[PDB]
Symmetry: C4
Subunit: 490 residues, 4 copies
């Protein structure tokens, strides 16, 4: 077939969110009752199908805590040093239930400075103290309550801790039973020791009251919040990866602009080979062939989308891409054959778009722009025309690339950059929870319409219908002047 | 066929009003002579193919009176209490010919307050008086003319009514013969009694002069204006329905966002089972399958459209919908097999759109936005830039849902809403009659072009032709500066 | 085939000017050398494929003179009385060579008032005088030169005409030979008489110098400018037609909004039957079937287009129409079978559009909006933002209908109108000739590209290629700021 | 097949840049390593696939020097006299290595005026002097250093040149060896003479240091910069061509609006016949048939595109054209059969567009608008709203045609023009090099995505995917406010 490539140049046709509507269907299930949980793997389980993009304007520790608390996942960005990125991961892991099996501790010879340091770093209200670092016999605890009486923090621990026997509990004490012990004895902390009195761990009422406050939290087997981390394909990738895995990261995202590059495929094999059980998310790919190549290399999740991002110019400057809905569907067709979930990354303006990507076969969606004006996002708020804004930049933008996204665009050494992205700003949105509430609300409605009691049914079942540009103008509100909008719509 | 659902995801294609034009055809019938009447059922017969949407910004008693007087139908909204909604229905039923068979009456021991109450409630110029409530022997009539001489309304009826024998007439006296009796004896009221003088009814010149004033009125077998009423699927639906049926409502609209929901199907069976002859309009559905399921459940009219409304965000936030012209056609294809009419609800900007929906198979169209700035619509007029406006909100909007449209979106108990609609404003349009005149005028022209002497011919015969976006720009006025517009166009 | 009509509803697809480009082709012919002439019939022959629409804002006598002088045809509108419309036709016929065979004349007993009247009415510089009305012996001529010495015009002709034998010439003297006689004897007028001296006719240097000034003029066999006239389908149509034919009109346009109406078909048969040789243009039709029905009724030209006009709302308000390029092609396919030419009426914004309509099979195009700001058009110039404007209204607009276009919309008696058109304004364009120069220039270029030495080759040969909306944005100028435009483009 | 032409009128469908995206593919090659060189012929070899359009607002000598220095090609425009155009070509040829084999020289009897003239004309820092014009024995050199001591330039050379034996070198001395000789003896000039001392040539450090400064330069076998020149089809074409060939032009562009015109085909045969080895670029053509006809006539490169230009109105005014991507593909399909390269001329807004045209089969792209605001372009900078602009006009614009582009539009003698183009302005872009850097950068990224190590692989391999208008809005940045843009994007 000498001329086959040449003749098939223009045959393919793609579709995106605005070309298409979901067709309503026979439904015995109400929006209220549907299940929105998704399993990306046995060690990664979300209560909502949402991930925040690793981007320096989108996700850092607080955003990751917030997302995890709602049931989704944050991906900490790589535009910081290895020490810095692993420190962020650790903060997220230790937000709740973090010191139960692996406590920090001090000796009476440390200064109050150290105790202030740990408490502020992890937001944990007390620090257990041991006789020395070898034996680790618990001698007492310095807490936030002890702290308010201390003026100069340069003093040694032994001076501020007045002994009284404090209530401790055996190893493997559990939240539910710690809940009554704290209640019964009227205490906020519960050190865990063995029969020899050696400190094994610590439980706080925060650990307990956070379970009540965020009942939908996405957590590992130990009850700690899930967190992911971005890693590029660079000579230092394994080093970055090593420190992440030691910080108990639940997933890495190997993040590149072209997932089908041999360099990416090799890095995945090399990472899978060193960490057989590590959750590995790899992207971006827009095709079936690319999807199969990442999976065979050992990726256990595949991230889909080339160019669709609100801030990306890849399609404009390089001329390259696939319309996102076709991309998701093309990639989901392949990954389904392997029982592998895909992430739809980029292009989602409204909650409806999310529904469409999930009905096209994605297990989960990853959002940049809808999360950047949110309160937990890294940047602070800027003023334009009296209203508050937050900066949002493409990983392809010159600004982002100077701060270490260069490898993503294969620009890694270059003195003069050629950006695939742009810089912009988004309105301040308030706390993340409210944005998720609307997102999940729109999903529940659509699943209601499509008769899907859970996300699996939705991917396997839901049917779309294509429309014209005139079909799009009908779908939006039209030809009436809008006095007041909604959180779901503009 | 394991993979069939998966592969058919993107095959369907929809069309809306702007994608399409009607093809002109051999015509011996002029616009002037065509028949625009439609039968939704033997007990529901419209002289124009128009219904006003039950929405709190669109239809209440006056709008329903106005619509009925022009030949269409109002649907009173449910965003009021059951007492309040049935009271509205009653006002519409009693506007004309309402007391002929079931008169109100008083005894001389009532106060003038009561007489003022009835006259103001029904806009009827006089109140018959009977000796007591059991016998009901007519002793006389207090009228608007008697009223102008009364200062304090706290006084008893017996004091103000000076006896003179008044002209009465036998039962079953008819408008045409009442017309000459009032004329012959020079009177405005004509009580109806039996041989024992027991009040049976009342006829007024208003009853007579309204037939002359609105020759196209849509009326039941008794000559009273038709009226419909909205009912949601709620634990209290039957209660609401019971009071409506007792107020002589001609149709209920069971109104939900997803008509294909099992909960809706069951409610229809349950209502059909209790009221075999009640006119039951059920929606909304966008498909053939949904249409068949409502009909088998006992719906005798089906209402079509998901998302197309000027104020709806359903398609944007939930991602769900079908382009309205395809929806109408898909649903009309199914209902035709059963001899069941469909209503096209939502999306109509211009009179031409109306024609297209009817040629696509709808028996009738239901309009929200084109009727909201009209004088008879419930809200009053707001000022923006010196011009008068009227508020118009989607039943999906937060505002509407707080006032009781929540059940429509399956949000019925929810503390935090996720709206499918938005709030806006429309220009004040003057009296309803002028808007209907243009609507019906555009319909008559199109039927002229398509060679259709009536609406049936139009549904069975008319052919469309699809066009591009460039085809749409040609169809509108283009590339000339508009100095003055028209009532039909912008 | 019970369900065939129902299923074929959406199958048809139309195209308009903006959906399509002409494909360039092998060309040995330069723009300069191509022939742009068209034959609508043996008695109607244009040197350019252009007609001005009969509309009260577009064509009256001067516009018709101007158009004819350039090689096209004016259609005088019917929004004036029968006397008035025939008077306009007569002015156009008599502009050049009008008195050669049928001269006006006076007797010495007429007042100078009469002579002033004729000269001003026809713009002819002199009036022949005869002894009396029966014999018609030429006694002399009162001219513009005689006039400048006359103060009071109330005086009798005999008083101002001082006799000198004047040079006359025999009947059937021709322009070329009159040209030398006027030159040889140094005179501006040349009365024509017989051997008995009875006035037969008159020739002026204007008649001669106009042939030189407008070498491309569209003229009848007698050398008089061609003119057309609009006629509606009304009880008075034949009366209007009779006076037109007596004024030597070359064509009538039976003009209706729906050409496929039985009423129009019957009127054409009835007119064809009374005037077998009259040129009859009938429209509007958008289909093949309609085209065949008009032709069999006796129309010898068919006018095509429903809704495409810059000022028409027909498609919006009635929902009715066909995209103009498909309309032209569909109608041209049918008329070609009969050797019948079609006119493309409406929708042409640029000279390129014209080329496309002709390549789609139209013999000629009819322009409203491109001719309304022209100097010869009936309205005068209005001021908006310091620049000069001309009003332009759709025959469907309320304004036009009040002035007698009602029958066109089948509204003929109606107290309350339902308009198919709108009112607007266009910039003042200067003399018509400059607008035609650009129009014809664009046509010559396109015919150059398509390799067409004449219009026939262009209709039979030229191929189009369809494009998207993105194809349209490429075709226009894009993405550069325009400092100065051109007469061909915006 | 009597009716075949008639029925095939609407079947063809075209695509342009915005309808289409490139599909990413398996890639072992990084953007950094890909080869962007193209061979238009053995005597024309570019290091980047870029040509600047011959247009009076785009390319003259400096632009041609700049383009050649970056690896592309300038085409000097024809809107100047033959002397003037050949002088421009000569300046480009002599920028580097121009006097090595064919030196200018003077005799001591010339004035310093002559020496100033040559140095300023060619930007060469010194002028060799010979005893007389026949023998041509080198007696010395007047340089820029000698010049700074001279006040009145009217004096004879012999007076200012103080003799010292100067270092010369044999014929065929090469840059690399001249580089050390200049270094060893500390001199900036190196005259070349034979054994009899007859001046053969000259080498300067500029010749040497330019090779280092512009390592990617596009050069002929002699090491001189490549340059092209525009020629129209006119009675004087050969004369213009003769002087160009004598100035050592590397290519002529026979430039016409319709390449398929017999007049163009004949001119190509006639030019090919007189200059069998001359590089001949001919256009414009949009079709396969036109492409084959130019090639058989002797064109060795074909230039593609009718109407797509940012400033062209051809499609609007003449209605003529083909969407550029289809045009390139249709023409590349034909030329590939002959081993003939095509140029994509017009329509490229962004670097991505460039990639698409090359993947559609073009060997090279030709840019007008992207190069007009560049510093080396002929016009100077205009002020609008405080920012600097550069005028850019279409060769079809009235302005350009008055200055001699008339023949291109077959308007060659015409008193009154009918333009195919428009006049506008573009922002000042700074030095050309920066614009090329971004252009080449975008190309390298796209080739990275498509897995193409060189341009051949890209044409033979790369696959596109079609998208809707909604697909285009996704591809651009969407729905976020842009605070700062990039050089690649807007």
């Amino acid at each position: 077939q000498s001329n086959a490539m040449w003749e098939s140049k223009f045959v393919k046709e793609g579709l995106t969110f605005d070309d298409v509507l979901l067709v309503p269907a026979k439904s015995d299930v109400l929006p209220r009752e549907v299940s929105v949980k998704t399993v990306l793997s046995e060690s990664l389980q979300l209560n909502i199908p949402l991930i925040s993009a690793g981007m320096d304007t989108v996700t850092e520790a607080d955003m990751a805590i917030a997302m995890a608390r709602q049931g989704g996942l944050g991906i900490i960005h790589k535009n910081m040093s290895i020490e810095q990125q692993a420190e962020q991961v650790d903060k997220v892991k230790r937000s709740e239930s973090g010191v139960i099996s692996d406590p920090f501790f001090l000796t009476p010879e440390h200064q109050v400075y150290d105790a202030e340091h740990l408490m502020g770093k992890y937001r944990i209200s007390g620090v257990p103290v041991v006789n020395n670092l070898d034996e680790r016999k618990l001698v007492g605890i310095i807490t936030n309550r002890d702290m308010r009486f201390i003026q100069d923090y340069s003093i040694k621990i032994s001076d501020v801790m007045t002994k009284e026997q404090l209530i401790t509990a055996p190893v493997g004490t559990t939240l539910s039973e710690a809940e009554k012990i704290l209640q019964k004895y009227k205490i906020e902390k519960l050190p865990l020791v063995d029969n020899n009195g050696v400190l094994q761990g610590l439980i706080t009422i925060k650990d307990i009251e956070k379970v009540i406050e965020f009942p939908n939290s996405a957590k590992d087997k130990q009850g700690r919040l899930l967190v992911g981390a971005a890693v590029g394909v660079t000579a230092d990738a394994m080093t970055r990866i090593d420190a992440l895995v030691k910080a108990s990261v639940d997933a890495i995202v190997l993040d590149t602009a072209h997932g089908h590059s041999q360099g990416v495929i090799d890095k995945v094999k090399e990472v899978r080979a060193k960490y057989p059980s590590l959750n590995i998310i790899a992207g971006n790919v827009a095709t079936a062939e690319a999807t199969k190549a990442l999976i065979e290399a050992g990726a256990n999740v595949v991230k889909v989308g080339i160019g669709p991002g609100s801030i990306c110019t890849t399609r404009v400057v390089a001329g390259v891409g696939v319309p996102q809905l076709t991309a998701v569907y093309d990639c989901a067709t392949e990954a389904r054959k392997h029982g592998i979930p895909v992430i739809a990354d980029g292009g989602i303006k409204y909650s409806g778009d999310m529904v469409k990507a999930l009905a096209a076969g994605a297990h989960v969606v990853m959002l940049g722009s809808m999360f950047a004006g949110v309160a937990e996002s890294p940047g602070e708020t800027e003023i334009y025309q009296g209203r508050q804004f937050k900066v949002y930049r493409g990983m392809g933008s010159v600004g982002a690339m100077e701060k270490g996204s260069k490898d993503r665009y294969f620009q890694e050494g270059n003195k003069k950059l050629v950006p695939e992205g742009i810089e912009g700003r988004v309105p301040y949105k308030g706390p993340l929870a409210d944005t998720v509430h609307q997102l999940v609300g729109g999903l529940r409605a659509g699943m209601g319409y499509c008769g899907a009691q859970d996300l699996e049914f939705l991917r396997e079942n839901a049917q779309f219908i294509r429309m014209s540009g005139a079909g799009l103008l009908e779908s939006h509100p039209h030809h009436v002047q809008i006095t007041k909008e909604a959180p779901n719509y503009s």
